[PDB]
Tab-separated table of C-alpha atoms and ligand atoms in Angstrom:
chain	number	residue	atom	x	y	z
A	1	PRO	CA	-39.822	31.698	20.525
A	2	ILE	CA	-36.796	33.996	20.254
A	3	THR	CA	-34.153	34.743	22.902
A	4	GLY	CA	-32.453	38.123	22.853
A	5	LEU	CA	-28.875	38.799	23.910
A	6	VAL	CA	-27.311	42.196	24.515
A	7	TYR	CA	-23.567	42.756	24.954
A	8	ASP	CA	-21.248	45.683	24.289
A	9	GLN	CA	-17.495	45.707	24.843
A	10	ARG	CA	-17.551	49.445	25.635
A	11	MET	CA	-18.767	48.452	29.080
A	12	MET	CA	-15.251	47.041	29.628
A	13	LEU	CA	-13.872	50.580	29.846
A	14	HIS	CA	-14.982	50.927	33.475
A	15	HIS	CA	-12.009	49.889	35.632
A	16	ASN	CA	-10.056	50.311	38.869
A	17	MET	CA	-6.913	52.260	37.988
A	18	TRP	CA	-5.166	51.574	41.316
A	19	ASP	CA	-5.812	47.831	41.262
A	20	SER	CA	-6.095	46.090	37.898
A	21	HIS	CA	-6.915	42.860	39.721
A	22	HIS	CA	-9.977	44.195	41.557
A	23	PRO	CA	-12.612	41.403	41.474
A	24	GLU	CA	-15.110	43.545	39.471
A	25	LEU	CA	-12.989	43.036	36.355
A	26	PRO	CA	-13.748	44.277	32.828
A	27	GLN	CA	-13.040	40.706	31.718
A	28	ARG	CA	-16.144	39.457	33.538
A	29	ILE	CA	-18.439	40.345	30.642
A	30	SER	CA	-15.933	39.495	27.884
A	31	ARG	CA	-15.381	35.981	29.298
A	32	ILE	CA	-19.139	35.386	29.584
A	33	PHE	CA	-19.586	36.530	25.980
A	34	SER	CA	-16.820	34.288	24.608
A	35	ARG	CA	-18.302	31.303	26.438
A	36	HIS	CA	-21.641	32.055	24.776
A	37	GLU	CA	-19.831	32.091	21.425
A	38	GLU	CA	-17.941	28.876	22.204
A	39	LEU	CA	-21.040	26.918	23.231
A	40	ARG	CA	-22.895	28.161	20.132
A	41	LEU	CA	-25.439	29.958	22.301
A	42	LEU	CA	-24.804	33.420	20.844
A	43	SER	CA	-25.539	32.360	17.265
A	44	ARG	CA	-28.950	31.058	18.411
A	45	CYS	CA	-29.918	34.418	19.936
A	46	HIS	CA	-31.348	37.589	18.406
A	47	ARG	CA	-28.709	40.270	18.932
A	48	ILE	CA	-30.239	43.264	20.710
A	49	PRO	CA	-28.365	46.566	20.267
A	50	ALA	CA	-26.934	48.334	23.311
A	51	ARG	CA	-27.628	52.003	23.983
A	52	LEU	CA	-27.018	54.814	26.447
A	53	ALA	CA	-29.671	55.490	29.046
A	54	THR	CA	-30.776	59.128	29.034
A	55	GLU	CA	-30.666	61.389	32.087
A	56	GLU	CA	-34.473	61.574	31.991
A	57	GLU	CA	-34.538	57.776	32.224
A	58	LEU	CA	-32.066	57.798	35.134
A	59	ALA	CA	-34.528	60.127	36.876
A	60	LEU	CA	-37.050	57.271	36.987
A	61	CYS	CA	-35.278	56.036	40.131
A	62	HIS	CA	-32.441	58.422	40.956
A	63	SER	CA	-32.256	61.981	42.291
A	64	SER	CA	-30.789	64.692	40.060
A	65	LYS	CA	-28.072	65.255	42.674
A	66	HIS	CA	-26.860	61.660	42.431
A	67	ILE	CA	-26.999	61.797	38.632
A	68	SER	CA	-25.077	65.076	38.459
A	69	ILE	CA	-22.239	63.894	40.712
A	70	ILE	CA	-21.633	60.604	38.901
A	71	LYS	CA	-21.938	62.399	35.555
A	72	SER	CA	-19.252	64.885	36.639
A	73	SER	CA	-16.848	61.994	37.219
A	74	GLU	CA	-16.395	61.685	33.449
A	75	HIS	CA	-14.261	64.844	33.492
A	76	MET	CA	-12.280	64.203	36.697
A	77	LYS	CA	-8.547	63.584	37.061
A	78	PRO	CA	-7.365	60.307	38.702
A	79	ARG	CA	-6.921	61.592	42.279
A	80	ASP	CA	-10.261	63.418	42.284
A	81	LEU	CA	-11.823	60.172	41.053
A	82	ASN	CA	-10.066	58.438	43.949
A	83	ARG	CA	-11.470	60.890	46.499
A	84	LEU	CA	-15.008	60.722	45.097
A	85	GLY	CA	-14.932	56.929	45.066
A	86	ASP	CA	-13.967	56.960	48.743
A	87	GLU	CA	-17.128	58.888	49.593
A	88	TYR	CA	-19.054	55.693	48.886
A	89	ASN	CA	-19.251	52.215	50.347
A	90	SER	CA	-17.093	49.994	48.109
A	91	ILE	CA	-16.915	52.067	44.906
A	92	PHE	CA	-14.126	52.738	42.415
A	93	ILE	CA	-14.598	55.208	39.553
A	94	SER	CA	-12.860	55.792	36.224
A	95	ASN	CA	-13.435	58.427	33.520
A	96	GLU	CA	-15.529	55.890	31.639
A	97	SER	CA	-17.583	54.623	34.595
A	98	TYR	CA	-20.479	57.001	33.946
A	99	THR	CA	-20.770	55.972	30.294
A	100	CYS	CA	-20.536	52.261	31.142
A	101	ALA	CA	-23.292	52.671	33.711
A	102	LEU	CA	-25.418	54.317	31.018
A	103	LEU	CA	-24.840	51.456	28.573
A	104	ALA	CA	-25.681	48.827	31.193
A	105	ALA	CA	-29.088	50.428	31.820
A	106	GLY	CA	-29.790	51.349	28.196
A	107	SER	CA	-28.988	47.807	27.086
A	108	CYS	CA	-31.512	46.462	29.611
A	109	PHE	CA	-34.076	49.031	28.460
A	110	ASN	CA	-33.752	47.830	24.853
A	111	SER	CA	-34.099	44.234	26.019
A	112	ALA	CA	-37.217	44.992	28.058
A	113	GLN	CA	-38.710	46.828	25.072
A	114	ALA	CA	-37.964	43.855	22.803
A	115	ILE	CA	-39.684	41.412	25.162
A	116	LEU	CA	-42.704	43.631	25.853
A	117	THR	CA	-43.293	44.364	22.162
A	118	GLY	CA	-42.984	40.692	21.251
A	119	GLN	CA	-39.768	40.853	19.221
A	120	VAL	CA	-38.353	38.220	21.561
A	121	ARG	CA	-39.864	35.964	24.234
A	122	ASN	CA	-36.981	36.479	26.674
A	123	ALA	CA	-33.493	38.001	26.895
A	124	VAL	CA	-30.081	37.917	28.579
A	125	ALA	CA	-28.073	41.060	29.343
A	126	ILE	CA	-24.335	40.618	29.790
A	127	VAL	CA	-23.609	43.961	31.450
A	128	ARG	CA	-21.412	45.854	33.907
A	129	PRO	CA	-21.098	47.740	36.203
A	130	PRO	CA	-23.832	46.050	38.320
A	131	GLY	CA	-26.772	47.928	39.818
A	132	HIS	CA	-28.745	46.404	42.694
A	133	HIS	CA	-26.820	48.104	45.553
A	134	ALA	CA	-27.283	51.538	43.961
A	135	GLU	CA	-29.802	53.739	45.777
A	136	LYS	CA	-31.929	56.707	44.752
A	137	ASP	CA	-29.329	59.163	46.005
A	138	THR	CA	-26.144	57.100	46.281
A	139	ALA	CA	-23.732	54.636	44.691
A	140	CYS	CA	-22.777	51.464	46.573
A	141	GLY	CA	-21.059	48.090	46.196
A	142	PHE	CA	-19.658	48.428	42.643
A	143	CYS	CA	-23.025	49.871	41.552
A	144	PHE	CA	-23.693	53.399	40.259
A	145	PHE	CA	-27.262	53.240	38.987
A	146	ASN	CA	-29.852	50.566	39.723
A	147	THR	CA	-30.179	48.939	36.309
A	148	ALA	CA	-32.886	46.458	37.343
A	149	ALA	CA	-35.003	49.027	39.196
A	150	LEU	CA	-34.748	51.463	36.288
A	151	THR	CA	-35.764	48.728	33.838
A	152	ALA	CA	-38.874	48.009	35.903
A	153	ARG	CA	-39.793	51.695	35.724
A	154	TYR	CA	-38.842	51.917	32.060
A	155	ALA	CA	-40.979	48.875	31.253
A	156	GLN	CA	-43.955	50.496	32.976
A	157	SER	CA	-43.178	53.746	31.125
A	158	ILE	CA	-43.591	52.057	27.744
A	159	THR	CA	-46.632	50.022	28.731
A	160	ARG	CA	-48.868	51.134	31.588
A	161	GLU	CA	-48.138	52.330	35.110
A	162	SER	CA	-49.662	49.239	36.757
A	163	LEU	CA	-47.631	46.705	34.760
A	164	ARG	CA	-46.797	43.980	37.277
A	165	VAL	CA	-43.061	43.371	37.395
A	166	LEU	CA	-41.330	40.652	39.373
A	167	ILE	CA	-37.692	41.214	40.286
A	168	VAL	CA	-35.898	38.118	41.510
A	169	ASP	CA	-32.481	38.815	42.977
A	170	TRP	CA	-30.390	35.636	43.278
A	171	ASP	CA	-27.117	37.488	43.569
A	172	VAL	CA	-25.501	36.411	46.863
A	173	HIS	CA	-25.816	39.939	48.274
A	174	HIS	CA	-29.061	41.700	49.205
A	175	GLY	CA	-30.092	44.301	46.630
A	176	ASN	CA	-30.659	47.061	49.186
A	177	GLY	CA	-31.165	49.601	46.413
A	178	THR	CA	-33.932	47.633	44.735
A	179	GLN	CA	-35.711	46.922	48.037
A	180	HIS	CA	-35.747	50.608	49.001
A	181	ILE	CA	-36.818	51.996	45.611
A	182	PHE	CA	-39.911	49.760	45.516
A	183	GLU	CA	-40.573	49.295	49.261
A	184	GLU	CA	-43.847	51.257	49.125
A	185	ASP	CA	-44.738	49.870	45.694
A	186	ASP	CA	-47.227	47.074	44.981
A	187	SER	CA	-46.691	46.988	41.194
A	188	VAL	CA	-43.151	45.682	41.575
A	189	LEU	CA	-42.612	42.495	43.553
A	190	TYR	CA	-39.048	42.263	44.861
A	191	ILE	CA	-37.820	38.850	45.910
A	192	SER	CA	-34.242	38.503	47.103
A	193	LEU	CA	-32.222	35.500	48.213
A	194	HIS	CA	-29.016	36.496	49.940
A	195	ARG	CA	-26.322	35.555	52.430
A	196	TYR	CA	-27.235	37.501	55.577
A	197	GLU	CA	-25.408	36.008	58.582
A	198	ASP	CA	-27.592	37.925	61.055
A	199	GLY	CA	-26.666	41.244	59.440
A	200	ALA	CA	-22.921	40.581	59.343
A	201	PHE	CA	-22.424	40.244	55.595
A	202	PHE	CA	-22.315	42.980	52.936
A	203	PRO	CA	-24.079	45.337	52.775
A	204	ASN	CA	-24.372	44.769	56.559
A	205	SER	CA	-27.924	45.941	57.244
A	206	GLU	CA	-30.990	44.522	58.974
A	207	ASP	CA	-32.984	45.749	55.957
A	208	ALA	CA	-32.099	42.402	54.381
A	209	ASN	CA	-33.940	40.380	57.010
A	210	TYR	CA	-37.127	38.386	56.383
A	211	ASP	CA	-39.207	40.681	58.597
A	212	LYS	CA	-38.889	43.515	56.076
A	213	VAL	CA	-42.047	42.850	54.065
A	214	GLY	CA	-42.618	46.291	52.585
A	215	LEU	CA	-44.330	49.499	53.696
A	216	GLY	CA	-47.859	50.843	53.235
A	217	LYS	CA	-49.485	49.594	50.039
A	218	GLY	CA	-46.154	47.878	49.415
A	219	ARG	CA	-46.586	45.536	52.384
A	220	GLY	CA	-46.207	41.912	51.295
A	221	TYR	CA	-44.459	42.892	48.065
A	222	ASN	CA	-40.896	42.694	49.393
A	223	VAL	CA	-39.638	39.168	50.072
A	224	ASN	CA	-36.255	38.753	51.770
A	225	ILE	CA	-34.927	35.204	52.049
A	226	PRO	CA	-31.820	35.539	54.316
A	227	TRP	CA	-29.272	32.724	54.681
A	228	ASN	CA	-27.533	32.175	58.029
A	229	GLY	CA	-24.522	29.937	58.830
A	230	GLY	CA	-23.165	28.975	56.502
A	231	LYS	CA	-22.379	27.515	53.060
A	232	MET	CA	-25.555	27.044	50.988
A	233	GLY	CA	-26.072	25.281	47.662
A	234	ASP	CA	-28.535	23.948	45.074
A	235	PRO	CA	-30.687	22.108	47.656
A	236	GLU	CA	-31.318	25.267	49.677
A	237	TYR	CA	-32.107	27.423	46.642
A	238	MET	CA	-34.378	24.835	45.009
A	239	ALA	CA	-36.281	24.475	48.271
A	240	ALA	CA	-36.527	28.260	48.582
A	241	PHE	CA	-38.061	28.512	45.084
A	242	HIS	CA	-40.435	25.618	45.771
A	243	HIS	CA	-41.848	26.937	49.057
A	244	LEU	CA	-41.524	30.697	48.545
A	245	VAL	CA	-40.448	32.239	45.227
A	246	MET	CA	-42.691	30.336	42.792
A	247	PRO	CA	-45.815	30.149	44.969
A	248	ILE	CA	-45.667	33.907	45.638
A	249	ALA	CA	-44.798	34.743	42.016
A	250	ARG	CA	-47.761	32.742	40.681
A	251	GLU	CA	-50.168	34.555	43.002
A	252	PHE	CA	-48.644	37.891	42.000
A	253	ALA	CA	-49.134	36.940	38.323
A	254	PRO	CA	-46.297	39.070	36.888
A	255	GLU	CA	-46.347	40.327	33.305
A	256	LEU	CA	-42.581	40.706	33.223
A	257	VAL	CA	-39.819	38.951	35.134
A	258	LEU	CA	-36.495	40.681	35.730
A	259	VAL	CA	-33.668	38.664	37.198
A	260	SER	CA	-30.932	40.437	39.101
A	261	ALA	CA	-28.638	37.590	38.166
A	262	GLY	CA	-25.432	37.778	40.127
A	263	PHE	CA	-23.452	34.558	40.069
A	264	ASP	CA	-21.438	35.161	43.215
A	265	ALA	CA	-23.466	32.471	44.981
A	266	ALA	CA	-21.789	30.088	42.547
A	267	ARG	CA	-19.251	27.474	43.585
A	268	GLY	CA	-15.770	28.950	43.155
A	269	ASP	CA	-16.731	32.531	44.031
A	270	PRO	CA	-14.549	34.016	46.817
A	271	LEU	CA	-16.980	36.802	47.762
A	272	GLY	CA	-20.061	34.601	48.085
A	273	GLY	CA	-18.781	31.426	49.690
A	274	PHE	CA	-21.736	29.348	48.470
A	275	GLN	CA	-21.968	26.374	46.092
A	276	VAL	CA	-24.788	26.903	43.584
A	277	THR	CA	-23.812	24.811	40.543
A	278	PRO	CA	-24.315	25.855	36.903
A	279	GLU	CA	-27.082	23.234	36.740
A	280	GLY	CA	-28.614	24.909	39.790
A	281	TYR	CA	-28.945	28.237	37.986
A	282	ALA	CA	-30.427	26.510	34.942
A	283	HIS	CA	-33.219	25.042	37.070
A	284	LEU	CA	-33.935	28.379	38.767
A	285	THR	CA	-34.112	29.990	35.322
A	286	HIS	CA	-36.338	27.217	33.952
A	287	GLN	CA	-38.791	27.653	36.822
A	288	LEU	CA	-39.027	31.408	36.260
A	289	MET	CA	-39.751	30.773	32.552
A	290	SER	CA	-43.075	29.287	33.662
A	291	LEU	CA	-44.084	32.835	34.624
A	292	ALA	CA	-45.384	35.883	32.761
A	293	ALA	CA	-45.754	34.032	29.440
A	294	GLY	CA	-41.993	33.490	29.555
A	295	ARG	CA	-41.315	37.237	29.539
A	296	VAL	CA	-37.964	37.077	31.320
A	297	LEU	CA	-34.869	39.318	31.284
A	298	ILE	CA	-31.667	37.947	32.899
A	299	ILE	CA	-29.497	40.852	34.060
A	300	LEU	CA	-25.926	40.246	35.219
A	301	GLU	CA	-25.186	41.618	38.672
A	302	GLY	CA	-22.278	40.235	40.708
A	303	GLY	CA	-20.144	37.131	40.228
A	304	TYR	CA	-16.367	37.175	40.281
A	305	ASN	CA	-15.021	33.763	39.371
A	306	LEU	CA	-14.524	34.210	35.620
A	307	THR	CA	-14.924	30.511	34.837
A	308	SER	CA	-17.835	30.014	37.270
A	309	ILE	CA	-19.874	32.958	35.998
A	310	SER	CA	-19.259	32.286	32.315
A	311	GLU	CA	-20.493	28.710	32.749
A	312	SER	CA	-23.361	29.701	35.040
A	313	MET	CA	-24.846	32.473	32.927
A	314	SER	CA	-24.343	30.345	29.799
A	315	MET	CA	-26.469	27.679	31.487
A	316	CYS	CA	-29.283	30.220	31.955
A	317	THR	CA	-29.153	31.336	28.304
A	318	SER	CA	-29.402	27.691	27.254
A	319	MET	CA	-32.618	27.450	29.290
A	320	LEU	CA	-34.144	30.610	27.834
A	321	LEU	CA	-33.312	29.193	24.418
A	322	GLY	CA	-35.481	26.215	25.320
A	323	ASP	CA	-32.969	23.452	26.016
A	324	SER	CA	-34.009	20.706	28.428
A	325	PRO	CA	-32.870	21.290	32.037
A	326	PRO	CA	-29.744	19.363	33.111
A	327	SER	CA	-29.990	16.638	35.752
A	328	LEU	CA	-29.205	17.906	39.255
A	329	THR	CA	-29.271	16.157	50.015
A	330	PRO	CA	-31.748	17.281	52.705
A	331	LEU	CA	-31.614	20.947	53.745
A	332	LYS	CA	-29.304	22.417	56.351
A	333	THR	CA	-31.330	23.056	59.518
A	334	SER	CA	-30.462	26.761	59.393
A	335	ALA	CA	-31.803	26.985	55.839
A	336	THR	CA	-35.044	25.349	56.979
A	337	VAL	CA	-35.345	27.910	59.762
A	338	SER	CA	-34.778	30.701	57.246
A	339	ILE	CA	-37.507	29.384	54.967
A	340	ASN	CA	-39.990	28.933	57.840
A	341	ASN	CA	-39.224	32.468	59.009
A	342	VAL	CA	-40.125	33.915	55.590
A	343	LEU	CA	-43.184	31.653	55.324
A	344	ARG	CA	-44.471	32.872	58.691
A	345	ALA	CA	-43.688	36.496	57.823
A	346	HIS	CA	-45.572	36.393	54.499
A	347	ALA	CA	-48.509	34.267	55.626
A	348	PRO	CA	-50.765	37.313	56.015
A	349	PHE	CA	-50.105	38.648	52.498
A	350	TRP	CA	-50.022	35.523	50.361
A	351	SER	CA	-52.872	33.059	50.770
A	352	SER	CA	-51.083	30.472	48.623
A	353	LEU	CA	-48.555	29.936	51.398
B	1	K	K1	-30.031	38.725	46.251
B	2	K	K1	-42.194	46.175	46.399
B	3	NA	NA1	-49.772	40.499	48.411
B	4	ZN	ZN1	-23.115	40.231	44.778
């Protein structure tokens, strides 16, 4: 049982040149890496090489128009980069952004390939910029290309079209990009847990609500678990996995599990405002390892407290490596209502509920 780890410092090049303190810092991935070194987790892993995604691979999920525009940013001068970035919801762009986006996706491709060919059982990808807000034709919320969505399509490309992929998105924000790409798809099961606040939390859309179960053949295969007022923690997430994520996943019988692993739901994160502990993430990870013969790829999304996310993602790697789960109140009423809402919404599609 081998765990893969992919990390490249070239992904640090992507930066905000008008605010060097912008929360999506280059140092996010470097601090996670060093913590993996420090805890002797890195030395236990099989080092998977990073690579650039090709344009043909980007076309698995993205329009050529979207690809061309972001590609052209590599040759732009600072003010043009400023203007282009302002055409999007919450995006900054540097000359290196396009290349870093390519490495993020290519790294995840190589990890998926390693898992699916049996070189490793599972893998962790310490990458940036993130991906899950990125749409087919647009960039959004610090994301340029949808790394997770692309990896699902890449995985199917190197296996068979009907490879069943589960994408679990435990980043505090709804992965609107991932939901939309696969909304009519029944080969990719998208499950997201996210702070919703009745549509008044980024990315501020009712697409993130529980009632959005998918379209056409894809009905049932989109699971939104929205949190409303207010601070949520380990109890809420554990209960969500127990009643929803793991029962549905088992019935879906995935062959590959991708985790859109943001750690902005972690205690200490300003943008999330939740209190999922590092031990919390370990237990979520451990549960997912019971799926798909352990074929699990952990892909970094959001998470902005450098100490919180280094410790949190390290905890997940420890689990993938096979360490025993660390030792961990009744649910908030609102959380219970959220879970019953999803249960009632997905009753027709999943007989296990
Ligand atoms: K999420
Ligand atoms: K789907
Ligand atoms: Na179903
Ligand atoms: Zn996030």
